[model samples]
Target chain A: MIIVTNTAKITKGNGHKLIERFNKVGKVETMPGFLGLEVLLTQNTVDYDEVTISTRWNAKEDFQGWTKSAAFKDAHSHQGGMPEYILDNKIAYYDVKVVRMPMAAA
Target chain B: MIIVTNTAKITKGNGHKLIERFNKVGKVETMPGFLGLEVLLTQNTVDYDEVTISTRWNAKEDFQGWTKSAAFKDAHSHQGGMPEYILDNKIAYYDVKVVRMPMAAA
Candidate 1:
């Protein structure tokens, strides 16, 4: 699997506000090769709160396909604009090289 | 869920070497609240190879408990030492706030 993470550094006490934007089902979920999505909040930070939007896909091309699809456009069209509380943001893509699970989990 | 990632920036071509070390099951898996693990290699980087050890857990306390357990010490005792190929590393923790799955998947 290909995992992607969009990390945003937010002003203190506003991480939840940013997470609220991603807590619902969206067009991206219905797109092909989209595996799952997660919103993660960092703990115990003094300067800022960090939120990461992590998405899993079947392949790199699958993610690129979503970027060009109408669903991607529609999903962002209603976002209005970036929120003021966000300080900085970055996106990272990773290829799953190895995975392990407990026998019971399998 | 709680996700912990230990990211290592390695010399340009040694990510796979690092990955080889984590490919097998270890004591961490048998610990209480242990979930799953994934080793991720970053794509499209020019300077260095980046590998992230991503592990999911039932809670923060569970992860902390592992750090103090005998398994934790044994797990690290045989590692020899940090590989020379690794340039830098950092650990980050996140609390999963939201999760979404496709309708068909559900």
Candidate 2:
């Protein structure tokens, strides 16, 4: 499987809202090969509260498909609710070599 | 929930072995609050290949306990078959607030 990890650095006093915003996930899960999606909040630093977004896919091409899809655009679309100021945004990719999630169905 | 992510950079041609080593898996699943573990290898860079190890726990104290436990020590122990020239190793922690793993049993 392939994974996409993103770090969304939030502004002051926006941690809760940012965390809440995660409710409206990127909407990429609708596509095939999208196995799962997860959001992780950091331990908290002075300047930024990081929100880590992880998406797992069965195929790299499916992931690339999401990137090229409109859902990708909608997630970033400046709709009604998006942070005005941010510290930094980072994106990373990984290939799953081993997985042992006891909670997983398969 | 808490997460510990480790990045191990390997020497040339050792990536396969490094991936293979994950089969031993540090024996963490036996610990309490230890939800799961995953190993992710990067797309590969010119000089090094990164193996990202992520551990999920039900609580921070559990994670801290693991750090103070024998299992954590074993994962890093210089046993027989470890790479001699690992480029780097990095670890990060996160507190999960939102999770949507369709493949997960829970």
Candidate 3:
């Protein structure tokens, strides 16, 4: 599986509101290769709220397809004022060679 | 590159202390194949705070060394209440096939 992470920074006190808006995603459950994702927001760090978008997919092409799809645009179009509140935005990718999931989830 | 994401749910109010504790890693800068890492934490979800341990490496084996080395053990031996506060600590692996960085950084 491949995981995509979109890391960005937003002003403090604005994460809670923006997080929900960012959480909106495609009907990934119905999409093949789409696994899951989460929004990690933390305040009191470097004077801004750091938001990292982490998603799991079956392959790199599947994720790239979503980004190019209408669903991605509709879901991230405004980002709930994220652009206005954003600062140093970046993205990092990693290959997962090891993993252990919860017995229940597994 | 290999990216290892360790997602966990921790109790509220303990994210800060735990975040710092979790950020500590190997002298990754000097590691043979180390890249970089980040710690993302958020709260108020499902009665717990969520934490993601995101790391980038030149290869899967590089990360494996850190996990097996004393540094990794010492750094994470006591995730500062992460174990105590943790709920669903599921780890997932992913292979990175694409990435984009800041224009300047690029």
Candidate 4:
């Protein structure tokens, strides 16, 4: 599996806005190879709040396909444009190697 | 839920070593509030290979408690010391806010 994380640095108090935006169901789930999405908010920060949106996929090609798909455009269009409250953004891709689950949970 | 990500940059070609090291099950699962763990290797890197160790917890306090527990010390003891191939490391904490799953999967 592959995980893509987009970390957005937002103005301290406006982090909730980003959370609200992602809470809405998007067409991403309809895409093939799409697994799940998680929106994470930074715990404590002094000046800025960080939100990392992590998306899991079956493979790198699958993720790239979604980015170029119609669903991607439709989902992103809802945002209109990047809001001013978002100060910076960084993206990283990771290939999942190992996962450990509690024996009972597994 | 809270997620702590530990990113380690290793010399090129040594990423697998880090992956192998984490494959061993640790006592972390026995800790209170411990959820799960994932070890990820960065895709398509140049000079350095990156491995991100992500651990999920029920809350920040739970994660902090794990760090201070004897289980933490026992787990680290196996590592002996930071390996020479590890060039840099970073830790980031994120609080999960939203999750989107496919309807059928849900």
Candidate 5:
């Protein structure tokens, strides 16, 4: 599967609201292989609280398709403007790969 | 190489303490291939909050050795008892696999 991992910084006291908005669009899309989404909150004391959003699809083409689709664009457009009020800056995206692992047994 | 993914339920107010203890043993052990550890807290509305600990090793043998080592045992033994107060049950471990992905392109 293809995976996209995104790290976002949320404003203090805005986490609950952001999560509420996220749940709305989290599982509705139907393009790209669409496996599932996992949201993670970091434990470290960084400048801003960190949230990692992971999305998995069947193939890279499907993933790219979702990213370019009108549905995706609309979802982003519909996201409320409250994030800007809480976050100091924009979110950061990371490309992740599983470099090594035992496949036969697992 | 080998990877271990663990899911733990933290007590309502014990997340900070669990993280503190985790940070202490996180990078000190020399046994396994020791790549690194990533901690993630779930954002869903599950009964108990979730923490996913991802650890990477260079080899399966090294990982097994670490699991069987005195240091690992000691670390677990020394972990403060606070987690018991917050978590409803014991932690759960999951074996993960990439399943499918484009490697050369990444």
Candidate 6:
């Protein structure tokens, strides 16, 4: 499984529109190797929130191919418009490690 | 090290308050094993967002100790009131894996 997290600060007064675009992209459930996308809002803040998008594939190369594909480019085309109209600053990306507690099954 | 992520949906009209409380906790940069807290908001959505909290510890036991500590208990006591006032449903927890692309540095 591979995970990608995008952290950004949305510009004031554009939160709603930005989220709308995000939801549109979030509908990529049919894509291959796509696991899930979790969108989070920060309480009491105007322009900050984190989006974690995860996908699983047979190998790293498979994941890389998906990201570099034309479909991926089209899906992310709005990114350029985002920083200009909806975000206050630059968007940052990070690699995440999802760790969980161990439990014995019944 | 062990990591825990709490994903929740904030209730309508209570996003600000919940974030306020979160910022209070986010100030825990003084605690041991503390790494950082990133607060993210999903654009265009109401009452839906995700919070990913990551911590690094020497061992699972060490992480467990922090979660079970008195301070932890007090910090999270507001979780109960959240569902009633600030959130719509139950809060979920997950393990996260932070992965990064490899690159040669100068």
Q: What lDDT does the true structure give each of the candidates?
A: 0.89, 0.77, 0.60, 0.87, 0.52, 0.46
lDDT for residue B6 in candidate 6, whole number 0-100: 55
DockQ per candidate: 0.72, 0.49, 0.04, 0.67, 0.04, 0.04
Docking quality class, candidate 6: incorrect
Give the CA lDDT, 0 to 100, for residue A11 in model 5: 68
- Residue B86 in model 6: lDDT: 36
* B1-106 per-residue lDDT for model 5 (tens digits): 4445665677655555545545543422455466656555554434655555567566556667777887778767954564364554343322222223222211
User: Can you rank all candidates by lDDT, best first?
Assistant: 1, 4, 2, 3, 5, 6
Q: For residues B9-71, what per-residue lDDT tens digits would candidate 4 score against the true structure?
A: 999999999999889887877777889999998877899999999999998898999999887
The positional error of residue A77 in candidate 5, measured at the CA in angstroms, is: 2.5
Identify the runs in model 6 with alpha carbons over 4 angstroms from their true place: A1-106, B25-28, B46-59, B77-80, B88-98, B101-106
Evaluated at residue A64, the lDDT of candidate 5 is 75
RMSD of each: 1.8, 4.1, 15.8, 2.2, 14.0, 14.9
Candidate 3 lDDT, B26-61, residue by residue in tens: 354445566655666542255667677766666789
What CAPRI class is candidate 1? medium
How many angstroms is the interface RMSD of candidate 4?
Answer: 1.9
Poorest 10 consecutive residues of model 3 chain A by lDDT? Answer: A97-106
lDDT at residue B58 of model 1 (Cα atoms): 92
Per-residue C-alpha lDDT of model 2 across residues B10-105, encoded as one tens digit per residue: 875677777787766356777777888888888855677787888888899988888888877976797676458677787788877887755322
DockQ of 6: 0.04
Q: Give lDDT tens digits, candidate 4, residues A3-59.
A: 999999999999998889889877777668889999998776889888889999998
1 against 6, candidate with superior TM-score: 1
lDDT value for model 5: 0.52
Candidate with maximal TM-score: 1
Q: After superposition, how far is residue A82 of candidate 2 from its true place, in Å?
A: 7.5
What's the C-alpha lDDT at position B10 in model 6? 64
lDDT of 3: 0.60
4 versus 6: better lDDT goes to:
4
Ten-residue region with minimum lDDT total, candidate 1 chain B: B97-106
